[PDB]
Design a protein around this motif. Structure first.
Motif, PDB file in Angstrom:
ATOM      1  N   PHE A  57       2.300   7.419  69.772  1.00  0.00           N
ATOM      2  CA  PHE A  57       3.170   8.071  68.800  1.00  0.00           C
ATOM      3  C   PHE A  57       3.994   9.178  69.448  1.00  0.00           C
ATOM      4  O   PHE A  57       5.193   9.306  69.171  1.00  0.00           O
ATOM      5  CB  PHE A  57       2.341   8.612  67.638  1.00  0.00           C
ATOM      6  N   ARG A  58       3.374   9.976  70.324  1.00  0.00           N
ATOM      7  CA  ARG A  58       4.096  11.059  70.986  1.00  0.00           C
ATOM      8  C   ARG A  58       5.254  10.526  71.823  1.00  0.00           C
ATOM      9  O   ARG A  58       6.367  11.059  71.763  1.00  0.00           O
ATOM     10  CB  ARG A  58       3.143  11.883  71.846  1.00  0.00           C
ATOM     11  N   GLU A  59       5.012   9.462  72.604  1.00  0.00           N
ATOM     12  CA  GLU A  59       6.097   8.821  73.343  1.00  0.00           C
ATOM     13  C   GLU A  59       7.242   8.423  72.429  1.00  0.00           C
ATOM     14  O   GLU A  59       8.408   8.475  72.836  1.00  0.00           O
ATOM     15  CB  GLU A  59       5.614   7.564  74.067  1.00  0.00           C
ATOM     16  N   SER A  60       6.929   8.003  71.203  1.00  0.00           N
ATOM     17  CA  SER A  60       7.922   7.582  70.220  1.00  0.00           C
ATOM     18  C   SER A  60       8.666   8.745  69.574  1.00  0.00           C
ATOM     19  O   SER A  60       9.405   8.519  68.608  1.00  0.00           O
ATOM     20  CB  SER A  60       7.255   6.741  69.129  1.00  0.00           C
ATOM     21  N   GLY A  61       8.492   9.970  70.068  1.00  0.00           N
ATOM     22  CA  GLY A  61       9.120  11.124  69.461  1.00  0.00           C
ATOM     23  C   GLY A  61       8.427  11.654  68.227  1.00  0.00           C
ATOM     24  O   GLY A  61       9.030  12.437  67.486  1.00  0.00           O
ATOM     25  N   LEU A  62       7.182  11.254  67.980  1.00  0.00           N
ATOM     26  CA  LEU A  62       6.424  11.704  66.824  1.00  0.00           C
ATOM     27  C   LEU A  62       5.344  12.686  67.253  1.00  0.00           C
ATOM     28  O   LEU A  62       4.817  12.610  68.365  1.00  0.00           O
ATOM     29  CB  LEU A  62       5.772  10.523  66.096  1.00  0.00           C
ATOM     30  N   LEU A  68       7.820   2.977  66.879  1.00  0.00           N
ATOM     31  CA  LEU A  68       7.234   2.453  68.109  1.00  0.00           C
ATOM     32  C   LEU A  68       8.147   1.413  68.746  1.00  0.00           C
ATOM     33  O   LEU A  68       8.330   1.410  69.968  1.00  0.00           O
ATOM     34  CB  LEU A  68       5.850   1.860  67.835  1.00  0.00           C
ATOM     35  N   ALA A  69       8.729   0.523  67.932  1.00  0.00           N
ATOM     36  CA  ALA A  69       9.661  -0.470  68.459  1.00  0.00           C
ATOM     37  C   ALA A  69      10.829   0.196  69.170  1.00  0.00           C
ATOM     38  O   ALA A  69      11.286  -0.287  70.213  1.00  0.00           O
ATOM     39  CB  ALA A  69      10.170  -1.371  67.335  1.00  0.00           C
ATOM     40  N   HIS A  70      11.318   1.311  68.623  1.00  0.00           N
ATOM     41  CA  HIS A  70      12.433   2.018  69.242  1.00  0.00           C
ATOM     42  C   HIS A  70      12.017   2.688  70.543  1.00  0.00           C
ATOM     43  O   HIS A  70      12.859   2.927  71.414  1.00  0.00           O
ATOM     44  CB  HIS A  70      13.008   3.048  68.271  1.00  0.00           C
ATOM     45  N   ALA A  71      10.736   2.998  70.690  1.00  0.00           N
ATOM     46  CA  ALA A  71      10.212   3.504  71.948  1.00  0.00           C
ATOM     47  C   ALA A  71      10.015   2.405  72.984  1.00  0.00           C
ATOM     48  O   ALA A  71       9.540   2.693  74.087  1.00  0.00           O
ATOM     49  CB  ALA A  71       8.888   4.235  71.708  1.00  0.00           C
ATOM     50  N   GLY A  72      10.354   1.163  72.656  1.00  0.00           N
ATOM     51  CA  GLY A  72      10.268   0.071  73.599  1.00  0.00           C
ATOM     52  C   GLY A  72       9.036  -0.794  73.480  1.00  0.00           C
ATOM     53  O   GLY A  72       8.817  -1.650  74.345  1.00  0.00           O
ATOM     54  N   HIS A  73       8.222  -0.602  72.448  1.00  0.00           N
ATOM     55  CA  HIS A  73       7.054  -1.447  72.284  1.00  0.00           C
ATOM     56  C   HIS A  73       7.427  -2.748  71.585  1.00  0.00           C
ATOM     57  O   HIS A  73       8.465  -2.862  70.927  1.00  0.00           O
ATOM     58  CB  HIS A  73       5.964  -0.713  71.508  1.00  0.00           C
ATOM     59  N   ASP A  74       6.556  -3.736  71.744  1.00  0.00           N
ATOM     60  CA  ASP A  74       6.750  -5.078  71.204  1.00  0.00           C
ATOM     61  C   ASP A  74       6.015  -5.122  69.866  1.00  0.00           C
ATOM     62  O   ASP A  74       4.786  -5.220  69.823  1.00  0.00           O
ATOM     63  CB  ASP A  74       6.229  -6.117  72.194  1.00  0.00           C
ATOM     64  N   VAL A  75       6.763  -5.029  68.770  1.00  0.00           N
ATOM     65  CA  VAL A  75       6.186  -4.771  67.457  1.00  0.00           C
ATOM     66  C   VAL A  75       6.406  -5.982  66.563  1.00  0.00           C
ATOM     67  O   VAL A  75       7.521  -6.508  66.478  1.00  0.00           O
ATOM     68  CB  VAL A  75       6.775  -3.500  66.819  1.00  0.00           C
ATOM     69  N   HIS A  76       5.340  -6.405  65.891  1.00  0.00           N
ATOM     70  CA  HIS A  76       5.310  -7.596  65.055  1.00  0.00           C
ATOM     71  C   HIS A  76       4.815  -7.210  63.667  1.00  0.00           C
ATOM     72  O   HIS A  76       3.740  -6.610  63.535  1.00  0.00           O
ATOM     73  CB  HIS A  76       4.404  -8.661  65.689  1.00  0.00           C
ATOM     74  N   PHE A  77       5.592  -7.557  62.641  1.00  0.00           N
ATOM     75  CA  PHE A  77       5.391  -7.065  61.279  1.00  0.00           C
ATOM     76  C   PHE A  77       4.873  -8.183  60.383  1.00  0.00           C
ATOM     77  O   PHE A  77       5.515  -9.232  60.259  1.00  0.00           O
ATOM     78  CB  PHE A  77       6.692  -6.516  60.699  1.00  0.00           C
ATOM     79  N   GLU A  92     -10.786   8.607  75.014  1.00  0.00           N
ATOM     80  CA  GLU A  92      -9.670   8.001  75.733  1.00  0.00           C
ATOM     81  C   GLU A  92      -8.817   7.144  74.809  1.00  0.00           C
ATOM     82  O   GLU A  92      -7.584   7.212  74.843  1.00  0.00           O
ATOM     83  CB  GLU A  92     -10.190   7.160  76.906  1.00  0.00           C
ATOM     84  N   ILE A  93      -9.460   6.327  73.977  1.00  0.00           N
ATOM     85  CA  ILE A  93      -8.724   5.419  73.103  1.00  0.00           C
ATOM     86  C   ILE A  93      -7.964   6.195  72.038  1.00  0.00           C
ATOM     87  O   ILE A  93      -6.795   5.906  71.760  1.00  0.00           O
ATOM     88  CB  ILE A  93      -9.679   4.389  72.477  1.00  0.00           C
ATOM     89  N   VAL A  94      -8.610   7.183  71.420  1.00  0.00           N
ATOM     90  CA  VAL A  94      -7.895   8.025  70.467  1.00  0.00           C
ATOM     91  C   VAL A  94      -6.700   8.689  71.145  1.00  0.00           C
ATOM     92  O   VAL A  94      -5.609   8.772  70.570  1.00  0.00           O
ATOM     93  CB  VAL A  94      -8.844   9.063  69.837  1.00  0.00           C
ATOM     94  N   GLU A  95      -6.877   9.140  72.388  1.00  0.00           N
ATOM     95  CA  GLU A  95      -5.769   9.763  73.108  1.00  0.00           C
ATOM     96  C   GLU A  95      -4.685   8.751  73.469  1.00  0.00           C
ATOM     97  O   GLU A  95      -3.503   9.107  73.520  1.00  0.00           O
ATOM     98  CB  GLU A  95      -6.285  10.468  74.363  1.00  0.00           C
ATOM     99  N   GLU A  96      -5.057   7.491  73.712  1.00  0.00           N
ATOM    100  CA  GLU A  96      -4.043   6.464  73.943  1.00  0.00           C
ATOM    101  C   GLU A  96      -3.159   6.296  72.718  1.00  0.00           C
ATOM    102  O   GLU A  96      -1.927   6.249  72.827  1.00  0.00           O
ATOM    103  CB  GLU A  96      -4.693   5.126  74.300  1.00  0.00           C
ATOM    104  N   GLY A  97      -3.775   6.185  71.542  1.00  0.00           N
ATOM    105  CA  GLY A  97      -2.999   6.031  70.326  1.00  0.00           C
ATOM    106  C   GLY A  97      -2.090   7.216  70.071  1.00  0.00           C
ATOM    107  O   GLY A  97      -0.929   7.048  69.699  1.00  0.00           O
ATOM    108  N   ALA A  98      -2.604   8.429  70.278  1.00  0.00           N
ATOM    109  CA  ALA A  98      -1.774   9.615  70.100  1.00  0.00           C
ATOM    110  C   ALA A  98      -0.597   9.615  71.067  1.00  0.00           C
ATOM    111  O   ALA A  98       0.524   9.982  70.695  1.00  0.00           O
ATOM    112  CB  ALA A  98      -2.617  10.878  70.272  1.00  0.00           C
ATOM    113  N   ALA A  99      -0.829   9.200  72.311  1.00  0.00           N
ATOM    114  CA  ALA A  99       0.261   9.155  73.281  1.00  0.00           C
ATOM    115  C   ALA A  99       1.318   8.132  72.884  1.00  0.00           C
ATOM    116  O   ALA A  99       2.511   8.351  73.128  1.00  0.00           O
ATOM    117  CB  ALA A  99      -0.284   8.851  74.675  1.00  0.00           C
TER     118      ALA A  99
END
Lengths: 312, 309
Positions: A174-179, A22-31, A165-172
């Motif tokens: 991952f899909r945007e991230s190439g998954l 997700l971070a590589h897809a441009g999201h702001d990721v905190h571990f 909608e929310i489940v589809e947001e989460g799927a999108a």
């Protein structure tokens, strides 16, 4: 899709992989690192991947206490189900208002056991990850195959339309991230479906001290795997969830295509980490028992795994 | 009368020695390289019967050198029975009694086509903890009783009972517990209730009887497997004693820590007695339409382990 701030709670191989992708897809990721913060923060996060090539997150936005984390829109829980009882304060500290909690965890009844401690304003979703991934050297993630995430909604303040909608947001995301990712209509059904793979393969890989390739090559172990798969499939149907046509042979085939893989439970055993027997074996056995449905092989495999854990 | 031991392993060594120590005329066929312990003799280290030494021991290198024997104890692993049929034949006196001191199911029936029909073929189910720890030495930990039964041969029913009783009397008069059984196949099923869980799980779980009994999960698994074997026996027409599982579990509870024969075989690279102890009972149960899921699964795992490097 707008930039999401994504918190990763428990950054093993699963949380590290999805958080890095997700971070590589441009999201702001905190571990949030429970165990390995000092190692990873100066080493960084690296990914050896037969699918996506080599990838690196350095510097990583790493944290040791959930209170230092910024409020996140999505909280990815990649930690094992064994520590789900101390998860709630961490989730609550890291959640933006109305945040989505996505349990990237295997087993059955996971969400129901965590909901009592999560505020009603948080969405609780499950994610069934079909992925071959494990921790390599420190700060390194070894990704051999697959990566798809099946998402489903468990509970929260959304009505039925908003849940989809929310489940589809989460799927999108991952899909945007190439998954690969699929919105599931029924999370519980989807959890029973994943059990048909985790139950035979995780346990037999520990018990038989073998990986997927020798297990599929030998005819007797392969017949055992099928028989155990039919017990899980039969238990699901008995409990109200009837699984698709020839689902056994489908995962038989996908695992046949699979590179030689040590399931996460194998690695757990090798490293002394407690096995996820409660969520993967005890819970579906308890459900089937309530339905009056016997799972002799799974029950015996579960007794064997408990025995092995107790041996010095 | 005259007694021969075809395959003087741990089982044949123990019973042959006990009989010979009791004054019977016993002739040992040393089939392995162990006939170099010719002149050293045979010794027994028994927690039950003490230290016994047999000096000298009538040993033979080959079966034709052996005199005709009225009784022939076969205590070797069942996998090698067909290769032993000529040796049994050479050493047998007219109308000799062949006693298979072996575990599993269907053992006598598989040997019967290779033996003259003039021989009496019997089965001896030996509840015993014993092994060959050091050369020429027999280590006896516990028990040792033999349930004898008649399988095939040219004897009518009255002669059948007299021959089974004569065999039981042989062991009793040597100081062993011995019981004449009216049904050899039923007595074989009784022994399966022990060999099937303990032999297999000792290999699968890399354990011995004591830790398998000390842990509640393996104890529960053993009892569930025992009830599968008991259930299969009834499906085939054999009612086993009530509370047999608890009786076996209690005897094993008091048993010293014991690695079953199958464990030692697996550890030393020997082929496992899977045919007679697992394949045969599963096939019989299948023929009677009765499923043994744990035993079937246990058998599949054992086969996987053997095929592994």
């Amino acid at each position: 899709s707008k930039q999401q701030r994504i918190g990763v709670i428990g950054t093993g191989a699963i949380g590290g992989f999805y958080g890095l992708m997700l971070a590589h897809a441009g999201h702001d990721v905190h571990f949030l690192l429970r165990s390995e913060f000092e190692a990873v923060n100066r080493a960084g996060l690296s990914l050896n991947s037969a699918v996506h090539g080599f990838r690196r997150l350095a510097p990583v936005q790493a944290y040791h206490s959930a209170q230092d984390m910024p409020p996140c829109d999505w909280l990815l829980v990649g930690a094992k189900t064994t520590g789900n009882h101390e998860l709630a304060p961490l989730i609550r500290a890291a959640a933006a208002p109305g945040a989505k909690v996505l349990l990237l965890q295997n087993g059955l009844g996971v969400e129901e056991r965590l909901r009592p401690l999560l505020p009603e304003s948080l969405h609780l979703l499950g994610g069934l990850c079909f992925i071959c991934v494990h921790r390599g050297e420190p700060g390194v993630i070894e990704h051999q195959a697959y990566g798809g995430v099946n998402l489903g909604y468990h509970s929260g303040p959304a009505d039925e339309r908003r849940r989809r909608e929310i489940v589809e947001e989460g799927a999108a995301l991952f899909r945007e991230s190439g998954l690969e990712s699929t919105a599931m209509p029924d999370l519980e059904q989807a959890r029973w479906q994943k059990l048909v793979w985790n139950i035979p393969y995780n346990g037999l890989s520990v018990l038989l001290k073998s990986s997927t390739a020798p297990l599929m090559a030998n005819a007797d172990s392969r017949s055992l795997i099928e028989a155990i798969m039919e017990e899980v499939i039969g238990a699901a149907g008995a409990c109200g969830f009837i699984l698709p046509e020839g689902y056994a042979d489908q995962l038989l085939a996908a695992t046949e295509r699979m590179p030689d893989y040590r399931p996460s439970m194998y690695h757990d055993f090798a490293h002394g980490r407690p096995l996820e027997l409660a969520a993967i074996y005890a819970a579906p056995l308890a459900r089937a028992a309530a339905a009056g449905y016997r799972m002799p092989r799974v029950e015996a495999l579960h007794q064997a795994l408990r025995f092995l854990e107790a041996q010095p």
